[PDB]
Design an enzyme around this catalytic site. Structure first.
Site, mmCIF file in Angstrom:
data_model
loop_
_atom_site.group_PDB
_atom_site.id
_atom_site.type_symbol
_atom_site.label_atom_id
_atom_site.label_comp_id
_atom_site.label_asym_id
_atom_site.label_seq_id
_atom_site.Cartn_x
_atom_site.Cartn_y
_atom_site.Cartn_z
ATOM 1 N N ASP A 27 114.981 122.595 74.540
ATOM 2 C CA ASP A 27 114.810 123.817 75.341
ATOM 3 C C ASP A 27 116.123 124.532 75.586
ATOM 4 O OD1 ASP A 27 113.022 125.579 76.572
ATOM 5 O OD2 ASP A 27 113.124 124.566 78.519
ATOM 6 N N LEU A 77 114.015 130.260 92.120
ATOM 7 C CA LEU A 77 115.083 130.403 91.119
ATOM 8 C C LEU A 77 114.525 130.565 89.698
ATOM 9 C CD1 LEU A 77 117.780 127.837 92.416
ATOM 10 C CD2 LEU A 77 117.750 130.319 92.695
ATOM 11 N N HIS A 133 104.597 127.475 84.308
ATOM 12 C CA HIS A 133 103.537 126.611 83.794
ATOM 13 C C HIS A 133 103.207 125.490 84.747
ATOM 14 C CE1 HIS A 133 104.750 127.972 79.462
ATOM 15 N NE2 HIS A 133 104.920 128.917 80.364
ATOM 16 N N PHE A 134 104.061 124.475 84.770
ATOM 17 C CA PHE A 134 103.783 123.260 85.516
ATOM 18 C C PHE A 134 104.798 122.991 86.614
ATOM 19 C CE2 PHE A 134 101.621 122.772 81.418
ATOM 20 C CZ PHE A 134 100.337 122.536 81.892
ATOM 21 N N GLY A 135 106.009 123.513 86.436
ATOM 22 C CA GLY A 135 107.105 123.283 87.369
ATOM 23 C C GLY A 135 107.813 124.549 87.821
ATOM 24 N N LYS A 172 113.599 121.203 92.311
ATOM 25 C CA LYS A 172 112.558 121.249 91.292
ATOM 26 C C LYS A 172 111.331 120.442 91.744
ATOM 27 C CE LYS A 172 111.910 120.898 86.338
ATOM 28 N NZ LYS A 172 112.596 120.854 85.011
#
Ligand code: 0Q2
EC number: 2.7.10.2
Length: 291
Positions: free
Chosen positions: A140, A29, A33-35, A56
């Site tokens: 964000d 989806l 970077h990290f997730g 997630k």
């Protein structure tokens, strides 16, 4: 005598606990970077009838655990629903098949006129005001993090950068800032990596611009800013951005956006945070335009 086992206690079923063995990946989806977030079906009956959920994961464990603790205790109609966890740890959320504004707006222009846009704007403000009231800064807010529940309802749908502002303090100081959405950020965030509630108001202004351009990629804040400052400055980009903003230059009025909508937007972008409008005043402003 006989082998001594352990008396089994009564095993209740936790509805917020998702077993890894039944969580089956369909597609990605989003990420970075990290997730990452993946569409899955939680299919314990194994017949493809189970619920679809957004999962997630990590590609930083403690950050995700904090994110999970934030979301689990947020309850608002304009905030994405926590469903549970899979335990390493995965955050399980509700899946909204229309996706984010990024996916939905380009495909539904015929359906979504100025009135419906202002209603989304109001709902984004209500969610953000709720977050601010719980003493959080989002950090964000962008169209890609605003999910479409229906033609008439949006929800804020990612909280990976959300931070708590200490009680009797006005802001949060950030350290890890490599991957900052700088074209969404207020001057004080770019210059000193300080984050007020008013900094979310600024980002909201930029998110409202995206809504009004139906998230067209060629009208994106990044695209419009890189035209204003130059697309080839590399590591000098942020400083030239800070500089352009100091000079009072802002993103232009979207096409077909009435001046009165544009002025609400410009109040989000006062250089000094204390000079900016609030979320509650934005709500009042839009509702006056709506009726
Ligand atoms: C693009 C997208 N569709 C979603 C449906 N349900 C969701 C989420 C969805 N996302 C993005 C996934 C990555 C982070 C955000 O940009 C939203 C997230 C949670 N439930």
């Amino acid at each position: 005598g006989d082998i001594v086992s352990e008396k089994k206690p009564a095993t209740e079923v936790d509805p917020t606990h998702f077993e890894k063995r039944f969580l089956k990946r369909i597609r990605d989806l989003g990420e970075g970077h990290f997730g990452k977030v993946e569409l899955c079906r939680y299919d314990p009956e194994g017949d493809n009838t189970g619920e679809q959920v957004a999962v997630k994961s990590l590609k930083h464990i403690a950050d995700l655990k904090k994110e999970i603790e934030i979301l689990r205790n947020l309850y608002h109609e304009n905030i994405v629903k926590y469903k549970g966890i899979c335990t390493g740890i995965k955050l399980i959320m509700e899946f909204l098949p229309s996706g984010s504004l990024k996916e939905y707006l380009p495909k539904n222009k015929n359906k979504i006129n100025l009135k419906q846009q202002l209603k989304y704007a109001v709902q984004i403000c209500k969610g953000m005001d709720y977050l601010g009231s719980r003493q959080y800064v989002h950090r964000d807010l962008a169209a890609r993090n605003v999910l479409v529940e229906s033609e008439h309802q949006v929800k804020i749908g990612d909280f990976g950068l959300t931070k708590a502002i200490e009680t009797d303090k006005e802001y949060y100081t950030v350290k890890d800032d490599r991957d900052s959405p700088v074209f969404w950020y207020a001057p004080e965030c770019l210059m000193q990596s300080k984050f007020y509630i008013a900094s979310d108001v600024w980002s909201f202004g930029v998110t409202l611009h995206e809504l009004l351009t139906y998230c067209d990629s060629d009208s994106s804040p990044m695209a419009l800013f890189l035209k204003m400052i130059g697309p080839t400055h590399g590591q000098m980009t942020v400083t030239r951005l800070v500089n352009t903003l100091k000079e009072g230059k802002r993103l232009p009025c979207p096409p077909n956006c009435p001046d009165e909508v544009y002025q609400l937007m410009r109040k989000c972008w006062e250089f000094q945070p204390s000079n900016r409008t609030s979320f509650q005043n934005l709500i009042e402003g839009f509702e006056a335009l709506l009726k």
